Amino acid sequence: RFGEMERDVLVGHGAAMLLIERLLEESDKTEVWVCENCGHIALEDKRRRRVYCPVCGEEERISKVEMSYAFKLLLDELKAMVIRPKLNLSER
């Protein structure tokens, strides 16, 4: 039903949250902890209920970023090969 022309139209109207609501919807986006120092996916251990970046120190001001599941698997594939996808979180 939806498609690319409709996406272009919604962009042309300037509506962005409408695009997120209509396309992404729910149960396909997830929460991922990201380190703000190096730019790697931080690890949260529920036994210790702590977040630590096992690259450049544990509590490097780790923040939380929501992303779609497909993008998470894409990042995993990119990291599987040598390419390193550093993420720079933008200040709100």
């Binding site: 949250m17 210790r48 209920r49 702590r50 709100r92």
Partner: protein, 185 residues
């Protein structure tokens, strides 16, 4: 051991608390969030004392609450290795005794009680020495020195702190006198 630390953080204030002044709202949120837990790097979080400064909130799309950056100070009890501490005995096991050093109770292993053969008599809830029949009963004020701190979980009770007594110049308040009694000469 006691300390006051100033910390900057970000606090989420739900819309239900918008009608109240931000300072006490963030204070209540911090009370509910931080008190009652142990910090691996700062010790036991005692209680939030006062919020110094608050910034204006930022609204996250998809969330009705507002997030503010606040500066506040908190009471902590942070012990360190090789630190003497005054405390009173609270409980005794076959393998040693709790020593109430504040928010948590230290334990002295039975083999490191004192420099002599020691037997345990749970009937009086105390251990028995030999050279002057040293008694380690409940309520005794000891000059115990900390030698081991095991920070494993953020739960206060789970973490263990190993503190010894056998090192020279150390004794309970009763044997502190007896220490000087042999030092009277």
């Amino acid at each position: 051991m006691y300390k006051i630390v100033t910390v900057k953080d970000v606090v989420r204030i739900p819309p239900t608390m918008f009608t109240m002044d931000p300072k006490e709202a963030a204070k209540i949120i911090l009370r509910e969030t931080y008190e009652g837990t142990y910090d691996k790097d700062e010790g036991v979080i005692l209680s939030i004392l006062e919020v110094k400064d608050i910034k204006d909130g930022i609204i996250i799309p998809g969330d009705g609450a507002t997030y503010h950056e606040v500066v506040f100070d908190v009471l902590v009890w942070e012990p360190k290795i090789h630190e003497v501490v005054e405390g009173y005995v609270a409980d005794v096991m076959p393998f040693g005794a709790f020593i109430r050093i504040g928010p948590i109770d230290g334990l002295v292993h039975i083999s490191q009680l004192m420099d002599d053969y020691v037997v345990y008599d749970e009937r009086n809830k105390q251990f028995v020495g030999k050279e002057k029949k040293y008694l380690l009963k409940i309520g005794d004020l000891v000059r115990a020195r900390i030698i081991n701190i095991s920070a494993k979980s953020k739960v206060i009770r789970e973490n263990r702190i190993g503190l010894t007594m056998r090192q020279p110049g150390l004794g309970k308040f009763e044997w502190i006198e007896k220490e000087k009694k042999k030092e009277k000469e």
